[PDB]
Design a protein around this ligand. Structure first.
Ligand SMILES: [Ca+2]
Ligand SMILES: [Ca+2]
Ligand SMILES: [Ca+2]
Ligand code: NA
Ligand code: NA
Ligand code: NA
Length: 449
């Protein structure tokens, strides 16, 4: 039925798949560039704290700025912004300056996102068009190719990045940080982020439960070459859950007039932030499901290795669409390292919990529980746990068993053998002992002869 056209951006109609569909019933036209007020704010290593404005209307502003033609460029695009953390975008720039020389462009479209939800969702079309226009200006006027460019889009910004990429042949990367479900999940490739929008698309899922009734803002749909579901993708450690409701006031939530626990939705960028300075902190394991992963079915890493979730995901060698699982901490440091162990019991039959700690040249882990029940000699129990550090080369391990019941005859349990497997290392470590220990007492095992 209807169409609106904007200088240099083309036309936008309120037709399917944009409007009048089951997923997007309302026929909506995007707001004008003038009403959206998109700004391109450049930060560089040399101007890390204060921005330089880049203008679509005046391409020579690029030349005037400290934009470097021999550095890579990352655009960082917001979506939902929580009242108490407006500066994550510029925090991300500063984190990148710690590891690399880069042009950091923060795309501010707040006025465009300050709408009803469904208006904001359509306004994505124009903002994406604008980012694409910037990439064309760089290519044509500055001979600066989109192969040097990475779009990082959070929330609604993920689909803005998607739109930019679809109009930009040769764009090297998009990261979608918890792309939103509402008005995008299950829509055609045109409408949303999808793997064709760049050469490499990686997506982090952190609030992926259905919007109704669970209030998960993110999507569970695979939208990248690599889709990561830390902690299962739906509920993050350290984050409070939203209350279940058959009524969702999207307009209210998006406006900030109605209560919403944004934690899960925000974690996607928090994990990304941390990954920049922890290039091995977020190894992720290919698996069919989180349940399978937690059942110790998807460990260790395949022959070609595990991808890192986050900044170093583009380093990953063995790439159709692949689903990856991992666990993170509940707070900073979020980084974790997964280990798998098998303990072969010795001594006498008892009842309790068996724990192990790993000791290496880089440090040692806390004690992790492996099994709790009847402890019979000769039996093997195996388990996988996510520890807070890479211990390096493991020199020794400590075993302990405990229960919470009085055992009058003071039984002793040991381990004849403990095998340890690190996620990313091919070598298994074997530790041995002839000894047994009293309850709640550390037995040290050294390498097997
Ligand atoms: Ca797309
Ligand atoms: Ca005890
Ligand atoms: Ca006891
Ligand atoms: Na310059
Ligand atoms: Na273009
Ligand atoms: Na959802």
């Amino acid at each position: 039925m209807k169409e609106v056209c904007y200088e240099d951006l083309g036309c936008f109609s309120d037709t399917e798949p944009w409007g009048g569909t089951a997923i997007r019933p309302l026929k909506i036209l995007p707001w004008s560039p003038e009403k959206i007020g998109t700004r391109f704010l450049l930060y560089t290593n040399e101007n890390p704290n204060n921005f330089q404005i880049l203008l679509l209307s005046d391409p020579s502003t690029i030349e005037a700025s400290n934009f470097q033609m021999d550095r890579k460029t990352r655009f960082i695009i917001h979506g939902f912004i929580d009242k108490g953390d407006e500066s994550w975008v510029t925090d991300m720039c500063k984190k990148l300056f710690e590891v690399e020389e880069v042009n950091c462009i923060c795309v501010d479209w707040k006025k465009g996102s300050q709408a009803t939800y469904t208006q904001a969702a359509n306004n994505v079309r124009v903002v994406g068009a604008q980012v694409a226009q910037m990439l064309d200006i760089l290519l044509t006027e500055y001979s600066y190719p989109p192969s040097k460019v990475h779009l990082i889009g959070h929330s609604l910004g993920a689909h803005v990045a998607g739109e930019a990429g679809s109009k930009t042949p040769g764009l090297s990367r998009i990261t979608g940080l918890d792309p939103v479900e509402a008005s995008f999940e299950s829509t055609p490739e045109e409408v949303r982020l999808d793997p064709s929008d760049a050469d490499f698309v990686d997506v982090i899922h952190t609030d992926a439960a259905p919007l109704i009734p669970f209030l998960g803002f993110g999507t569970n749909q695979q939208m990248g070459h690599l889709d990561f579901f830390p902690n299962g993708g739906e509920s993050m450690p350290g984050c409070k859950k939203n209350a279940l409701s058959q009524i969702v006031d999207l307009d209210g939530i998006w406006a900030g007039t109605r209560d919403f626990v944004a934690c899960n939705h925000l974690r996607s960028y928090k994990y990304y932030l941390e990954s920049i300075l922890n290039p091995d902190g977020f190894a992720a394991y290919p698996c069919t499901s989180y349940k399978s992963f937690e059942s110790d079915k998807c460990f260790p890493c395949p022959d070609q290795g595990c991808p890192q979730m986050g900044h170093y995901a583009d380093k990953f060698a063995g790439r159709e669409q692949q689903k990856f699982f991992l666990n993170t901490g509940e707070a900073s440091n979020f980084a974790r390292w997964r280990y798998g162990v098998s303990i072969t019991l010795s001594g006498r039959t008892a009842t309790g919990q068996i724990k192990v700690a790993l000791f290496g040249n880089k440090g040692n882990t806390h004690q992790y529980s492996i099994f709790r029940g009847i402890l019979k000699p000769g039996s093997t129990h195996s388990y996988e746990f996510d520890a807070k550090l890479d211990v390096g080369t493991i020199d020794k391990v400590k075993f302990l068993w405990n229960n919470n019941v009085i055992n009058p005859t003071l039984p002793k349990v040991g381990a004849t053998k403990i095998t340890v497997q690190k996620g990313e290392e091919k070598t298994v470590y074997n530790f041995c002992s002839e000894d047994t220990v009293r309850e709640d007492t550390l037995l040290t095992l050294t390498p097997c002869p």
